[PDB]
Nucleic acid binder design. Sequence first.
DNA 1: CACATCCCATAATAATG
DNA 2: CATTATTATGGGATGTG
Length: 146
Amino acid sequence: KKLKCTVEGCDRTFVWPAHFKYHLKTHRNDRSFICPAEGCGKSFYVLQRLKVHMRTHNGEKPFMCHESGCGKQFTTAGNLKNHRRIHTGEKPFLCEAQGCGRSFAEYSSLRKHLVVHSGEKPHQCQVCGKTFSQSGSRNVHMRKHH
DNA sequence: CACATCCCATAATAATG
DNA sequence: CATTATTATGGGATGTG
Ligand SMILES: [Zn+2]
Ligand SMILES: [Zn+2]
Ligand SMILES: [Zn+2]
Ligand SMILES: [Zn+2]
Ligand SMILES: [Zn+2]
């Protein structure tokens, strides 16, 4: 009755043998799929990730928005699915805070919103020490330094 | 500068051939 | 063994107030 990870602090259990094999590779950092483009040298855990990474070198964007007048092209279906919400107005990711009730178009936009309630500032400036809500805010303060 | 917002890319999960 | 699909994740870039 195996398929429980046995590394020291993990205590996780799996269902599919391939997902189990993936998990073990992350513990070992076993990245056997290497990008052959000159000067890149990045590596990945599975062949699928290398194939998607290649689109950063050959410019393929196979997923197109069919909104009239838009025709924008994206490297993953998931990104196109997010983009389409600017034409549909769908905001399916809802803030479950007590009195907020705000919705968002992207899952990650909700993540960046939850720090407004928690009040945390996870992004730090390595020079001065100021603390920022988002990384982009930290970077425009870095452009003020240099 | 704090945000929401739209764009970009990889990690992890899940299931199938 | 292998491939495919979708979600989860999070940084980059920007325009408003
Ligand atoms: Zn583990
Ligand atoms: Zn590469
Ligand atoms: Zn569009
Ligand atoms: Zn909220
Ligand atoms: Zn600073």
